[PDB]
Design a protein around this nucleic acid. Structure first.
Ligand code: MG
Ligand code: MG
Ligand code: MG
Ligand code: MG
Ligand code: MG
Ligand code: MG
Ligand code: MG
Ligand code: MG
Ligand code: MG
Ligand code: MG
Ligand code: MG
Ligand code: MG
Ligand code: MG
Ligand code: MG
Ligand code: MG
Ligand code: MG
Ligand code: MG
Ligand code: MG
Ligand code: MG
Ligand code: MG
Ligand code: MG
Ligand code: MG
Ligand code: MG
Ligand code: MG
Ligand code: MG
Ligand code: MG
Ligand code: MG
Ligand code: MG
Ligand code: MG
Ligand code: MG
Ligand code: MG
Ligand code: MG
Ligand code: MG
Ligand code: MG
Ligand code: MG
Ligand code: MG
Ligand code: MG
Ligand code: MG
Ligand code: MG
Ligand code: MG
Ligand code: MG
Ligand code: MG
Ligand code: MG
Lengths: 187, 147, 103, 68, 51, 52
RNA sequence: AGGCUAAAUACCGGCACGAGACCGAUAGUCAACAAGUACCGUAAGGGAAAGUUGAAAAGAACUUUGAAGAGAGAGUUCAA
RNA sequence: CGGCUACCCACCCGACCCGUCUUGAAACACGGACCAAGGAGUCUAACACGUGCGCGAGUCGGGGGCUCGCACGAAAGCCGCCGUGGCGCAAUGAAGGUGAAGGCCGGCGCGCUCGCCGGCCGAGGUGGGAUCCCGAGGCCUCUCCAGUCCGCCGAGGGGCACCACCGGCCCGUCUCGCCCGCCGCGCCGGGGAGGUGGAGCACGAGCGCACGUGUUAGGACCCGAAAGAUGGUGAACUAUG
RNA sequence: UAUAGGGGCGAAAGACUAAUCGAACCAUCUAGUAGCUGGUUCCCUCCGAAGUUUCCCUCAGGAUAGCUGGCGCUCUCGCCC
RNA sequence: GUAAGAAGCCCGGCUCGCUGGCGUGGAGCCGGGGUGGAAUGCGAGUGCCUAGUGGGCCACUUUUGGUAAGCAGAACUGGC
């Protein structure tokens, strides 16, 4: 024997993208070449986000993609998103900003072309910026998923605020013992 | 797909994924929700609080039909009518305001949120909230009750 | 028998459901039967239109669907008397007549 | 049918299989569990800090920028 | 036979104190009056009876 | 029956053409374009095998 | 506190019927065949096994040992 | 001539007969005479998680309808003034019900542990936070000079996601006090300041299909009982008239 | 010829009732349930336990925590600190 | 068990409805200053899903009951 330590062979990583999308594989090839040949950590992170799954790339929203450009210093920069930018029903005004994302929805593309912006894809973003200069890489609201609101140390023991599974949210379904002090214990 | 099944991979192993010592035979713990109070209390408690007992009043012959009131927010209040309508109605013409009826859209109660611009409208609904009514008064619109 | 954090399940399968399994293997069969029934009606019965008798404008009784509208059953005999025609004469003209519908 | 009653043998090894963890990361410590009279101090003090800190701190920043 | 009628009422001017009069409190006042319509009548009958 | 990316399908109700992921997808043209080869490190083709 | 009425619906029995990502004589109905047959139990009832020569019998004329069963020659057949 | 090998034999060394109950099997523990065929984690419904695809604050035709009669057609295509409906976009209450925007500036009432008027901004702040931006500086065969050229960085800034904390809003209860409106001046409604309970809000990420794992109920990985109920058949043996 | 199954019959042994009687035979419910024996079908590679806390009419069993595997995500190094 | 620093040290100033002789004390907020702060080794943090397990035994040392046990029961560590 040599290694007195435990044997953890592979750390965590996903090397090749599990998706069989040919377009995603071509983008993986192109951004892998740029990541290993341009010394660009932007291309490193975008290549890792292309290795990243469908679920861990949450859909970006149009109001958030406006507000992350409304901050000072983001006038002429391009909002690069590895993921989808969708419509928002809340917004009223759209600026003249540039979009570089995968699979922008139809109403979002329509409102951006009415507002006067320019949407791109990753090959056009690579032709315009090999190292990724003038870009801001954005990500979406992961923790607001319905799946993540069931996740915690417990459903209710220091009251725990983590949403136990039930059919119908209301009366007669999980509201009696441990949910109030009058009927048994209370958390 | 039986070719992608774990059973096809586990051919050759004697106990077949369930151990030689424990011997999972038929139903070792019971059936279904068996032992909800006696011996599975650490799984019915600590994972489903509230499962045992009565909670309140008992409305005999309840319907999910009389309490029908789908709520609309002030964010959703604008896109019930098209954007062309509000642009061509508030393109610097006069003090006229378009009517946004939520009853035709299928919503009954208007609730209060943010993002309500300067251009006032007239909202007709069967119910309102005081916050949404104050937001409509602040942007200058008119409140109309219908039935 | 239970497990980690999952929803409490009470399926209604304790009754011997395997005898009474009605699976729609004859759903395109009923579709072809009902197509041929409508076509044979439109051929053999009359030059009357399909869905022959005329249905009324009717509001749905609810606090939920009363904003919408519905094709009812019949023309509500007071309405038919104001229109001024006999009952079975209206039924042979093509007017659907329901004696229960009030106004 | 007498069985073994209770032991703590082969327990510290299972503890050190996964490396017993300090909580080791609490920056800006949690605030629940503290005196309600002290909280009636601190919340009103924080919201009046949010309200009335503008002009004196602004003139002090101008004065220290002029003197340094 | 559907004939989903489309009343429009597009052009109208913002008007007088109806917008100040049709506030949220009318619904709560009507709710309280519907809840207390009968007990006030009983108290009026008792006040007319007891002289 | 399907339409271009400008207009919708006139025979179908609510169908459009899908989103095109890579518009100009010539990967050889992209990797041999001067804008990409301007921003490359150097061709490092040495092997550097095991030294006894 | 009297009554009738077709349609949509159901059908593992029956008369014909067409198809199959099904099975292949230890499988598929118990039964591909003289199968609810042979056979068992007083009776209620239980209940099998069992497909394939060849293209056509052209199934081996005739000689010979043995009383025959069988065998050695000979012959038919692409092939005994 | 060469040749490892599912051929046979000899020699040196090691070598107890497999499978599982067990802390322990070669066991004087159990099953196995031998061989051929069959033989055991399947399917449905539901849930949860992960992954892949389509659309995306929407999503889904499984329910029907439309095509000319077609072997594959029990397929497939379409409906859209067929979106009825399921899930999600709003939660909290037992319920009546109620129901998520605040911040900045000027003036006014004693800026009074205190409200109004006018304008502006807009989902808050702090500490980390991939990335991105400005840039002192210096580096290229002899000089003043420049532009892209070789070429990074001290320091500064806006800060994705997410974590930790503070603050704010909504619902039901608790304490303290004042003010406002009248389709009618009442045991009428509404509003303020604090600490609590919620599966909340604090720019939403769901819907549909498929695959994988786990659980549940169905015969549920295969075989197995002493037993219970229902309906029939036997006094040709035997027991008694 | 009469008595037929929780019935018959018994000079009483719970003996006999078609080789079965301290509850007959045949079929159905029924593939009854079993925390209990036995078995569970191809290869290679990697990681790899426990017989412990608490609770249960719990002691041959289960739930929970611990031990374990898989799937990732967030970052960090390669250039006097 | 604890401490061996950039989450730390000092200076200046606001807020408080807590407290009170006192601009007193304490908390919070804002701005600025200098990182070379014991040794050795190592790249770390975190989320989801889940099988098996729930009959153990032996040995050095410390020990409980028993006269003693290859006996029954405990502690650390190692092994089966
Ligand atoms: Mg080695
Ligand atoms: Mg290992
Ligand atoms: Mg194994
Ligand atoms: Mg088990
Ligand atoms: Mg389990
Ligand atoms: Mg049953
Ligand atoms: Mg034990
Ligand atoms: Mg009648
Ligand atoms: Mg009748
Ligand atoms: Mg009928
Ligand atoms: Mg055969
Ligand atoms: Mg047979
Ligand atoms: Mg023949
Ligand atoms: Mg041959
Ligand atoms: Mg055992
Ligand atoms: Mg033993
Ligand atoms: Mg053995
Ligand atoms: Mg023996
Ligand atoms: Mg043996
Ligand atoms: Mg034997
Ligand atoms: Mg076989
Ligand atoms: Mg999924
Ligand atoms: Mg609807
Ligand atoms: Mg539902
Ligand atoms: Mg059985
Ligand atoms: Mg019983
Ligand atoms: Mg006799
Ligand atoms: Mg006798
Ligand atoms: Mg009987
Ligand atoms: Mg009985
Ligand atoms: Mg006998
Ligand atoms: Mg007995
Ligand atoms: Mg019996
Ligand atoms: Mg079975
Ligand atoms: Mg126990
Ligand atoms: Mg467990
Ligand atoms: Mg783990
Ligand atoms: Mg692991
Ligand atoms: Mg398992
Ligand atoms: Mg055990
Ligand atoms: Mg011992
Ligand atoms: Mg012992
Ligand atoms: Mg060893």
């Amino acid at each position: 024997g040599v290694d007195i330590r435990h044997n953890k062979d592979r750390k965590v990583r996903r090397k090749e993208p599990k998706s069989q999308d040919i377009y995603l594989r071509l983008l993986v090839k192109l951004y892998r070449f740029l990541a290993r040949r341009t010394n660009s950590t932007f291309n490193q992170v975008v290549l890792k986000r292309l290795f990243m799954s469908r679920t861990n790339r949450p859909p970006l929203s149009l109001s958030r993609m406006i507000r992350k450009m409304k901050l000072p210093g983001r006038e002429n920069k391009t909002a690069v998103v590895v993921g989808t930018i969708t419509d928002d029903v809340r917004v009223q005004e759209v600026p003249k900003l540039k979009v570089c994302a995968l699979r922008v929805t139809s109403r979002a593309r329509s409102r951006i072309l009415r507002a006067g912006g320019k949407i791109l894809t990753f090959d056009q973003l690579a032709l315009d910026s090999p190292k990724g200069c003038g870009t801001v890489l954005l990500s979406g609201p992961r923790k607001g998923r319905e799946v993540y609101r069931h996740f915690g140390k417990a459903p209710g023991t220091p009251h725990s605020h983590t949403k136990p599974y039930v059919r119908s949210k209301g009366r007669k379904f999980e509201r009696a013992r441990g949910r109030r002090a009058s009927r048994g214990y209370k958390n | 797909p039986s070719r992608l099944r774990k059973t096809r991979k586990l051919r050759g192993h004697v106990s077949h994924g369930h151990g030689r010592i424990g011997k999972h035979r038929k139903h070792p713990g019971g059936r279904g929700n068996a032992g909800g109070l006696h011996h599975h209390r650490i799984n019915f408690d600590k994972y489903h609080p509230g499962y045992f007992g009565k909670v309140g009043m008992k409305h005999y012959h309840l319907k999910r039909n009389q309490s029908f009131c789908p709520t609309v927010n002030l964010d959703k209040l604008w896109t019930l009518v098209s954007e062309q309508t509000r642009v061509n109605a508030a393109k610097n013409k006069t003090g006229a305001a378009p009517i946004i009826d939520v009853v035709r859209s299928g919503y009954y109660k208007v609730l209060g949120k943010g993002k309500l611009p300067k251009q006032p409208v007239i909202v007709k609904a069967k119910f309102f909230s005081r916050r949404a009514e104050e937001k409509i008064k602040s942007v200058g619109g008119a409140c109309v009750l219908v039935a | 028998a239970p497990s980690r954090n999952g929803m409490v399940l009470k399926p209604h399968f304790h009754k011997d459901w395997q005898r009474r399994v009605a699976t729609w293997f004859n759903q395109p069969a009923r579709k072809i039967r009902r197509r041929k029934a409508r076509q044979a009606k439109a051929r053999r019965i009359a030059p009357r239109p399909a869905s022959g008798p005329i249905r009324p404008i009717v509001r749905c009784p609810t606090v939920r669907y009363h904003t919408k509208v519905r094709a009812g059953r019949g023309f509500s005999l007071e309405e038919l008397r104001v229109a001024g025609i006999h009952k079975k004469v209206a039924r042979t003209i093509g007017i659907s007549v329901d004696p229960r519908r009030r106004n | 049918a007498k069985s073994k009653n209770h032991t703590t043998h082969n327990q510290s090894r299972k503890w050190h299989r996964n490396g017993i963890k300090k909580p080791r990361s609490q920056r800006y410590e949690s605030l629940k569990g503290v005196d309600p009279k002290f909280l009636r101090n601190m919340r009103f003090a924080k919201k009046h800090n949010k309200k009335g800190l503008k002009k004196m701190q602004a003139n002090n920043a101008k004065a220290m920028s002029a003197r340094a | 036979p559907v004939r989903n009628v489309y009343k429009k009422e597009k052009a109208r001017v913002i008007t007088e104190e109806e917008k100040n009069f049709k506030a949220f409190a009318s619904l709560r006042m009507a709710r309280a009056n519907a809840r207390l319509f009968g007990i006030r009548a009983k108290r009026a009958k008792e006040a007319a009876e007891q002289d | 029956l399907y339409g271009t990316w400008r207009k919708a399908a006139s025979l179908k109700s609510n169908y459009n053409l899908p989103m095109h992921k890579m518009i100009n997808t010539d990967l050889s043209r992209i990797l041999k374009s001067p804008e990409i080869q301007r921003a490359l490190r150097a061709p490092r083709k040495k092997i550097h095998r095991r030294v006894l």
